[PDB]
Amino acid sequence: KLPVNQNILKNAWYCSQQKTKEDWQEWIRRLSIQLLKESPSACLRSCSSLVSVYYPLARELFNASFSSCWVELQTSYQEDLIQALCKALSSSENPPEIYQMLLNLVEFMEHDDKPLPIPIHTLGKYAQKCHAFAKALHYKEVEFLEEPKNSTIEALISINNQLHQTDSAIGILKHAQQHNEARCFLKQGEWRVCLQPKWRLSNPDSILGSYLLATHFDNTWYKAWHNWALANFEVISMLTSVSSSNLIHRHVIPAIKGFFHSISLSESSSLQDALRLLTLWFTFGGIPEATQAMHEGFNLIQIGTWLEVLPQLISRIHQPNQIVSRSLLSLLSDLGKAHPQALVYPLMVAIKSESLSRQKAALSIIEKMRIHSPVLVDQAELVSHELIRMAVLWHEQWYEGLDDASRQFFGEHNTEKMFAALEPLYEMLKRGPETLREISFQNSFGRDLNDAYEWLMNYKKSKDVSNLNQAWDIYYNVFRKIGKQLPQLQTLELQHVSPKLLSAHDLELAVPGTRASGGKPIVKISKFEPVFSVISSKQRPRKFCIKGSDGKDYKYVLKGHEDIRQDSLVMQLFGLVNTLLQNDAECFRRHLDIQQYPAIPLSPKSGLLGWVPNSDTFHVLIREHREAKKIPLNIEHWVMLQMAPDYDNLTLLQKVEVFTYALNNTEGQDLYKVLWLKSRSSETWLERRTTYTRSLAVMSMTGYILGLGDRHPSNLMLDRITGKVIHIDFGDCFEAAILREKFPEKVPFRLTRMLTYAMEVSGIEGSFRITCENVMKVLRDNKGSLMAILEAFAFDPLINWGFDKNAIRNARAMLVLKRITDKLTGNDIRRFNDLDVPEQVDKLIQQATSVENLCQHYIGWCPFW
């Protein structure tokens, strides 16, 4: 292994006879060259002569050689090399030549493989002397965590000041203090509406006159046209609330003209204006003057605005008025003339929807598309139907048909509802086989299903309880012979599921997913990858891959038997919020960003979600870190289960102390250390921590206003390169979790002990809270626009998924409206407490960081993590 050859390197270790940078460099590469001759590795002994001949590869070898030599060197020489490296780092304190690389090597071995016994204060002082400010910051953070000192606190404050971290410095100081102790008319109108509230019979007239004078002085002024139109909107709203039906005629046409002029002036952010106009037309589509007003505004308005503001047209594609229907059909015909590739997917969603009026209205769309391109829609439905049958994979139909029947039969024994479930499940077997996998089930497990069918017939014809029990026994039998091998389908092969997808290649349709502004270029599809990966999320979603015309791969996660389109509508809320942060100068300076992935609604029973690339979730991110140390995964849960045999079946108060016992006994800095481990360098860790902090801050506030809850480390997803958080399954929104029976929440956004320990030494009140005030002020700065956005999808019947006739839905939506307005304003708890922005931030922080507010939760939410 190693012969006796260490008698010559002692002089190169301890010399203490040099006083020059060149002499120190000579000593350094002399010891680096001679380090290889005692290396125990076969792949390192032979490279000694090569390193002696050629120098630069020893720089990249400098980690392997040091790791080889350190383990082989003996304990008495360990402190010798310790003092040698300490004196090397202490010498030549003014010019940093190679001591930064020395500290890089020291931290590199300090990652996981038995760090050196160097004092951390000495490490910090070498970093400070050798200008490594970020390494000094990490060392001083470790020193502060070991023991809090005022000198250390001011050292981190100065470090943040030189690194331009004012938020970090302020937060550290606060933590130390808290622990150690025309234009004139517009101006007149806005000041008037600020000093005196609306909803009278005199202020609307005054602001209407002011806006009319401003428009007369500047007839091409966008905010004037928009303000006049919205003033007519509030007048019409109060008239409707009072109800007249005659004073609305004098205001519907000026509002329409102003909205058209503003849209034609801007053509950039016309989302709210377009949806406002559509809501106005849908509310009053029986005014002939409005009909000719919008007819003459056809030429003034473009088609690109409706192209960008497509989705609500498909959402309201059903029309109860003939004139409204004709106008919408003409508009969508113009949309089909101008890049129809952005609406064919919602088009056959409308085709396969459950509204007979929607299919009858869409027959005209089909007929007008036949004269343009039959091949587009034909190939579109051909490639669609296979994806819906593959999203809802073929055993899941009768799997859910057995399960939903089974638990309600255990509940209250509704045999008619059994028959209703089982009537359509047996239709396609006598209709005709279609796919190879369907054949593979047919020739295997058809006889038991048939026998169950005539046993159902016998039960219907005789009402025989014993044969009902026998039928339920064979149902248990088939449930077993499905559910045993259900988790054994780790992959699906398209050649046997649906080979026609492979047969149809060189597809000319547009690639589903994200779209560009206006008319996006057409991107074709080459083929499909027939291999998929199955995810375990109680629904078995799969990983779909598409080979596009560009030679790259477009990959998505496929979800089935769900009307997911709520995530699609929240996607334009993400678009609006990123637009507002881009518009804000402070947010643009802070470089805030939320990356929304492409996601198209494939069907009322299927959809695609964009999987973010080059990233890993927090769920997986802890497994390899734990098994590197070879320590159990659910360690804290097992530790508290050691004395809590009935944790789940338990009352409110006694869970708190066992949870506290688990927290006290269990260390909670795994993510905090693994980000340092996976960091490329100190500045790498700096950019990771910055991105991590402001991403989690902005996303948790957006979830707070959105009502997005039910967040768990499975849907929490870090980015491998940067560290941004990306969530999945946004069905829970508008605080829908507060109404469901299964353990209603008390914490709005999941900010756990793991997050607090991963936070910097400034704590939750530092840069996180400093970003909190900026996010709250920029979100309160756009009060009217967000309300105009959210007013559209309240009363519609396509949202009742997380809160569940027409009057009841309207009342529930209006209660949601007052609840979210109270949530924004801060008067949701106490009527007298009209809390402002910083008081709201403090209240939210304490209410989310309270332990009782997070302990009482469902195990499905995984509350301990």
């Binding site: 004395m643 045999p645 009935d646 009352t651 409110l652 108060l653």
Partner: protein, 300 residues
């Protein structure tokens, strides 16, 4: 005299100070026992577990449960007896007051109520009930009324933990999650809403558990979640009699003796203790619990 304790062992067990060893153990490995209560004349044993209140027999040789009664969706918190044992009530996670009877029961009426209560107490007239909620509310109900009740709000939306009531019909003490407590004086002619508050005492600052006071109205002893058992005076100079600490784990609900001078302490420290309040010294210490002990019952 007999006393019984239960906890995370899933085994209820009796105790006897004369022999120093446990006498009888009964397995209930289906749920965690929250509370238990022994009948005054030592005939049946009831408990608060999960969605079921069952009646065991003392003199039998560890049989199957003699009686069992369900009807609550959530887990049950406490049970209230009667001195004539004609009406059995329980308090659960729904606030709906139920009533049942011994000796071949039928189905009586059930009362539905919101604000899921925590603890209940029956006035000695055997016709009136006071329940405490975790929002600082007191619900007063009686068999005579059908839907009307009384609302008492000692604190505004604050998690009132529990309460205790005087067997002589004088005092009503509260228990708040912040360690606060209120004492209410209520003189004779108890069949009226005339609970007059007197003072307010901040005994602790952390979470607290049930307060028990003796039939003789001369003491008020509480126990909290900081290894603290503190007894104050309720009729003589209104000051702290005795504090007690030193327990390894946090002390759970406690019980008294007949002479109002001995008190038991059951905690999750795998042990239970019995003390003389006058001498504030260890009198008995029973051990054998492999897990913690949460609930205890005693009568003489």
């Amino acid at each position: 005299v007999i006393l019984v304790s239960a906890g995370y062992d899933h085994t209820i067990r009796f105790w006897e100070a004369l022999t120093g060893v446990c006498s009888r153990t009964i397995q209930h490995s289906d749920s965690q026992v929250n509370r238990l209560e022994i009948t005054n004349d030592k005939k049946l044993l009831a408990t608060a577990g999960h969605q079921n209140v069952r009646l065991y027999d003392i003199r039998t040789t560890n049989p199957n449960p003699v009686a069992s009664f369900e009807g609550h969706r959530g887990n049950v918190t406490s049970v209230s007896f009667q001195q004539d044992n004609r009406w059995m009530v329980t308090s659960s996670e729904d606030g709906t007051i139920k009533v049942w009877d011994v000796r071949s029961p039928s189905i009586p009426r059930n009362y539905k109520h919101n604000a899921p209560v925590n603890e209940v107490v029956i006035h000695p007239n055997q016709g009136e009930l006071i329940s405490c909620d975790r929002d600082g509310n007191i619900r007063i109900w009686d068999l005579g009324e059908n839907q009307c009740t009384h609302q008492l709000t000692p604190e505004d939306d604050t998690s009132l933990q529990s309460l205790s009531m005087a067997s002589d019909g004088s005092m009503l003490a509260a228990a708040n999650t912040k360690g606060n407590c209120y004492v209410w004086e209520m003189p004779n002619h108890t069949d009226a809403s005339h609970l007059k508050p007197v003072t307010k005492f901040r005994a602790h600052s952390t979470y607290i558990t049930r307060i028990l006071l003796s039939s003789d109205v001369k003491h008020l002893a509480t126990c909290s979640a900081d290894h603290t058992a503190r007894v104050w005076s309720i009729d003589d100079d209104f000051k702290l009699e005795t504090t007690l600490d030193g327990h390894q784990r946090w002390v759970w609900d406690c019980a008294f003796s007949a002479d109002s001078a001995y008190l038991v302490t059951a905690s999750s420290d795998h042990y239970v203790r019995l003390w003389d309040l006058s001498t504030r010294e260890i009198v008995r210490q029973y051990g054998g619990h492999h897990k913690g002990a949460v609930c205890v019952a005693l009568n003489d």
